[PDB]
Amino acid sequence: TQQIVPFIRSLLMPTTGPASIPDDTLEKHTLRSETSTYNLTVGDTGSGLIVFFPGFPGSIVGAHYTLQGNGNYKFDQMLLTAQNLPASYNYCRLVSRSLTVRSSTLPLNGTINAVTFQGSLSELTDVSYNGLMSATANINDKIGNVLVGEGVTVLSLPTSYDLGYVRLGDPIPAIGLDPKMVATCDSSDRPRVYTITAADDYQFSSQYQPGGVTITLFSANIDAITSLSVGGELVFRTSVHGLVLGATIYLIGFDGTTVITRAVAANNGLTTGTDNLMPFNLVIPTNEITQPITSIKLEIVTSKSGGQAGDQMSWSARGSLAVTIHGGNYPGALRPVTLVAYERVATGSVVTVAGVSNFELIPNPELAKNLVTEYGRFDPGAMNYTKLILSERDRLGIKTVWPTREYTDFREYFMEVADLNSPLKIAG
Amino acid sequence: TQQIVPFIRSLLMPTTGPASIPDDTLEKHTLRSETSTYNLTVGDTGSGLIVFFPGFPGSIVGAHYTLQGNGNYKFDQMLLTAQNLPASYNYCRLVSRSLTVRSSTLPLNGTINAVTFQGSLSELTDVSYNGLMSATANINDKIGNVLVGEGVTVLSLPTSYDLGYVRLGDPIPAIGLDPKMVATCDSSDRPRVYTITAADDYQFSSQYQPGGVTITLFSANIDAITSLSVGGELVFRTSVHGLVLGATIYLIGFDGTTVITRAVAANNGLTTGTDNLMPFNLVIPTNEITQPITSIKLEIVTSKSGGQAGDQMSWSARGSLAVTIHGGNYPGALRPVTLVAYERVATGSVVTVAGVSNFELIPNPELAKNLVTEYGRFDPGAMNYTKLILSERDRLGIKTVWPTREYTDFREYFMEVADLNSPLKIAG
Amino acid sequence: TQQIVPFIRSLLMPTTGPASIPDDTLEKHTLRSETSTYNLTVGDTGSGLIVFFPGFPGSIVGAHYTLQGNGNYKFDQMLLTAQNLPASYNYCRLVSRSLTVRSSTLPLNGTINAVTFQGSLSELTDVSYNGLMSATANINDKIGNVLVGEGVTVLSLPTSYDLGYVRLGDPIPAIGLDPKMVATCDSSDRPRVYTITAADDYQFSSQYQPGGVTITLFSANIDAITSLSVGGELVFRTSVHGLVLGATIYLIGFDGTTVITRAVAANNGLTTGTDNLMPFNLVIPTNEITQPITSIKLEIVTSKSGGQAGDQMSWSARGSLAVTIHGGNYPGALRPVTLVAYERVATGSVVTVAGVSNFELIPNPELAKNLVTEYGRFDPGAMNYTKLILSERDRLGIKTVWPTREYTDFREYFMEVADLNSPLKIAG
């Protein structure tokens, strides 16, 4: 520390403002801060979960779920940046981010558990208040039973530098006959791909039914916050004449709710002694994803034209699907997740979220006319200092989740120099 | 203090993370932290007791008892580590541990008394809120009438170094016809042995009874949290024909409740003019011990085949028993106990427990495939510094039980160097 | 030597008082001295033997035997600490110990031979006055023909540091119907185990006898001062109908006397063509051991229901037993033995024993209320200095058995600094 190092200051105290990342990604950019402010209402059980995406390169900060009588979560709302970055910028990179979670009202109240998990949302094996505590072995990535009144601070720590600029989901110039037409340029670099072999000569056998017989061929945990696509093909064989197949893909939210439902093939006759192809050509736009996607499943309906008492409908199925979630493997886009769980909070009280997110940004064409961009400030040793700090992360006690009181202490313990500027004022 | 000394840091501030014990026990190990988080509910009397085992080499942290109208305690639950260490590790050693106890919700709220007692649970003569205060003469091992809102901090101070690695109660590969079959390898090194001479020619005499005459031959305070065994033999002599003996061993919990009941001999004819042997071959597995064992008693039922009005049944008994509690004398396993008693807390309010336990661990065979182990970091003078600190324990005011506010102050008073790392960043 | 080193002072001059052992066994403890004072009477032969247990962690110091006309020893009494430590303390560790043995009255007076033997009492091959001298090859562990008037000094030298605290045989809270009921918590850590395969298809054959035929199946040298147990099983096979077996275990004292006798199976019918089990479930409490146990033997009585002239009773026997003596392998508990033999002392004269034993102690629950405990005084280099001294033991002539006159000289030769305390008195 001398004066200090703008980037370290920004990284460890994001509410302080942005600084350019001192890596090798030399783009002309501009630096911005976006606040997040939410007043969430506590449900009947007095318990709930905030899912944060600490590294998300853009306006999505997290999602809030209340816990319900029956032990299920129920989606409340997305937690966003104050304004929608893709409306003004085309490219983006996360510099630093911190968020605060505490109670502010009573209609001395409940506790919080928090973890930073090194995987995407659907990968967590246990998301209960208590179960959170073992999502990492890292002591500085979990905090237990912090009083809600005092609150918790979530600090975003890096998962890789020299990251590319991410395209935001920015609207692209387009005209179309449909009012509800939407055209964007999506986060794409570093896609995540899931491959699901749904069937390898899977035999299906069942008696006839008016209305048909529905099965769930498979269900698989995947993650999506933004646009994705499904490709691939199932091949069906049969000895039985006049079978008609229906198939639907469901994308399921964290709360078990159907987020998106897409008929992949409806009313589709099967021919005897031949391959019957069922292609998958699904594109799911960002705006359709009303809450984080947690799993995908495929249902198949089998029915017969004629039909009787005992008819026995049978088919064989083979094939694999590929689920590409665009930009999904970009560190921060899905990957690190910070969960903040609260319980025993009085029903009707307010859980207050306040955060600052800092970005390197490239303006969209209209803003670029009035927004000057520059290469980052050069200070050598900024990156080495960051590397040193992170290297000593555990001995310094630099947490991703803090009791706010401890984070406040840390701020003043660190940051003991901010020294005006000695004789520039008297120099010459 | 220079930078500092990882071990001292861990010992005095366990929430900070683990460090290797700088003794002579050089094993390849790995270092881990496990949190403990509980939200306990206050009962009708507004009063209760938390029993901590500050030195326990494993996942058992303590037990919670509520105090009842009639002045008895009633077991609530075991307080454990976040995850069950024996499921993942085979050997273990406690590095450091701290726990916090404070109220978090209102249904401001009562007082705490706490002590660290240099003996096992059943050895305490007085466990009432007030009586606690005289369990030690050591001023830094007791704290009185701390406000519950502010809370108490329990700090685990060593009871011996150069301790062996303890085998956790880890499951061992086994197949068996019984679904409920359980096979473990238990904490064994340093067993504790109790010897009870239950009778030395004890004469029994009583009139006949349909259903028999039951006596409690003896009752004795012992301690067990994990597996134990009972061995030995009673020998019975008699002049009366056709006497049948029943005998049962009861292991009683801290709350006076029967934890385990084992028939040692049921329906057992006594022959005239001969020794009649009653062997003890009891093995009590860990999983059967649902709460800490506090005493053992033996009941004997005496009945006669025929029977009338006045029949006078008599026998003479001789023999001693041995109760071996496996690994019981391992310092920390039973020995030091920290009691945290609360009273005058409003009924229905939450007493919140949060702790961190630090361990040296050896992975089980499956984890050992992916868990690198190492000999501890060498720093000379770490142990001498520890010895110095502990030697000056009282003048430094290093308590095992703290008002949390005072412990917090101590943390910042100590730990005045954590200094980044000066020119490594500028060296060469 | 600077001032000096409390521990070295205590180790080499125990009459000086206790000091904490400077090892890694960091327990809160208290330091105490216990004297031993005995005036033993010399028997008819003018000859006898004192067996010392120099390292015994507790109140047992040794035992006195007189030598008799027929060349046998006869037990006189146990030599103990002034007060019974287990009545006041639960845990204990030996710091240092010295004892003096000299004549004090005339009814000038005979000679002493002494050795420190690196094994337990029963392991000595030769315990005669003269034979002692070859129990070790170590010149500083034997002393020959010291005049009784001048006397001998026994100095306890370490057999391992970093020893655990030993549980004393302390009474445990217990109620029972029998007045003579005794419940203790025994020295257990580091048990010693003997395994005796008493028979491997041993054939027995003998003619009938009214009253039976008794054999001694085996006899084996073992050591016990405190509680022990016998486990295991013999299995008997036979072709002869109506055989009844009796079996008794005898624990024999150093003087050939029966200390303890326990019927293991009395009146026990053997069935033809089957295994007949004879289990061993013996627990022998400390208080029953009136003098050191030196061997164990098992007698078996064989009798027949019917019986005639020539009947030939036969059985086959198989099995092994295990004798566990609790805490038996704890260095000091049984292991080093110092023998002080005297002869040619006038009958009726007094052999005077005076000693000091120094301990680290943990008080029992009742005393713990008024007994402050602390971690040991820290002085670095205390242990290294001890290691150096012991490393040079032979060149320094540090004996375990001394002519008292030579030990006295050594005391004043060593210990040439005890220097008041220069200007603290004038400092500031």
Added chain:
Amino acid sequence: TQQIVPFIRSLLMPTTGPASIPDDTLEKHTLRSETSTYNLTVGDTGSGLIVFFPGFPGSIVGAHYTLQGNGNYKFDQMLLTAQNLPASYNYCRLVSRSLTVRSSTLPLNGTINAVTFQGSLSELTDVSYNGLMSATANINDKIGNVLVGEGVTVLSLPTSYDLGYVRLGDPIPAIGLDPKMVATCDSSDRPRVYTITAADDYQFSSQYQPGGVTITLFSANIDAITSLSVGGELVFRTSVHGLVLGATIYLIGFDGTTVITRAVAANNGLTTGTDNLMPFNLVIPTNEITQPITSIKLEIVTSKSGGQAGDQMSWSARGSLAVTIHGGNYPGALRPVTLVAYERVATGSVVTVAGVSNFELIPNPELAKNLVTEYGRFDPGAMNYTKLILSERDRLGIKTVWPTREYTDFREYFMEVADLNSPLKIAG
């Protein structure tokens, strides 16, 4: 201050533990701390008084009185040390003491006034909440209108050093026919003596009454917490035949309640023309004094054998009494009193008292067998430093009664060195 001075540390921060008083009273002693913990219930008026005896050499810490509707106090309970010192020790000396008084529960809340008065309880002219404030002129011995939630700290400041050891009221070995027999050895050194000349030829005159005529001859304020005796004699003269005198001594508590009542002479005929003696031979044992004694009064009943309408009974009385309260003048035994008054506290709320008392102690014969005693640690300049500190008491603002918040600040302002122990750890 260098490191510091154990005694000053103990004196100014008693919760820190005991230290030997650095005066000339060189006794082999032991050092102990005793906590005091009470949860007092607030009465109907929301107002009450705690009387502390800050210098009391023993287990009596103070007494709690609630204030009542009618403006009278009513005794609640004695405030004691955690355990009864006289059960374990025979002699005692107070080193240092501090106590904390604050509210803890609610069914913010009230105020506290406190003073240290340089006299015994009964000597206070005004004990009302407001009146307290003028019991001393010393600004550092009074504190006004401290919030109850924050609380008050009572610090015991010396009233003389070189005090003798005080005998505690320890039980003495005794057998007697009465179960309720009690034999103690009492605080005696430095008795306090009151002399009351109850009459100097006091003429009594009154008409006859069936049942008699009762008068209160005198009433006088005295102080007693422990055993006292009354000696002396009244002499009665009369001209009237057949007068019978009854006389009773009452010892009255602070709350106006009779603590002890003793008939001094019942039914006692007076002879004409002679001295009629009425001796006083009262011994009042400690255990009879259920609350502090505040005054003594003597009532006399006068009756006549015969009796009529107008009979005029007359007597003359002369004499003085002496009330000796044993050890009463020992500084601390009665003398300094600290009053903590609260008012406007909500009815039913808890006023929490927590304290530490530090003592030099000599064990009773049974404990002396296991309790090592020593002369105090020598440090020169300890007493001079104490004398300096006290000499500058007012400029340093060292109070006997503090707002707890101010005392806490003082603790950290003082006590700025507690410095581990620099290179002992690296010396040689």
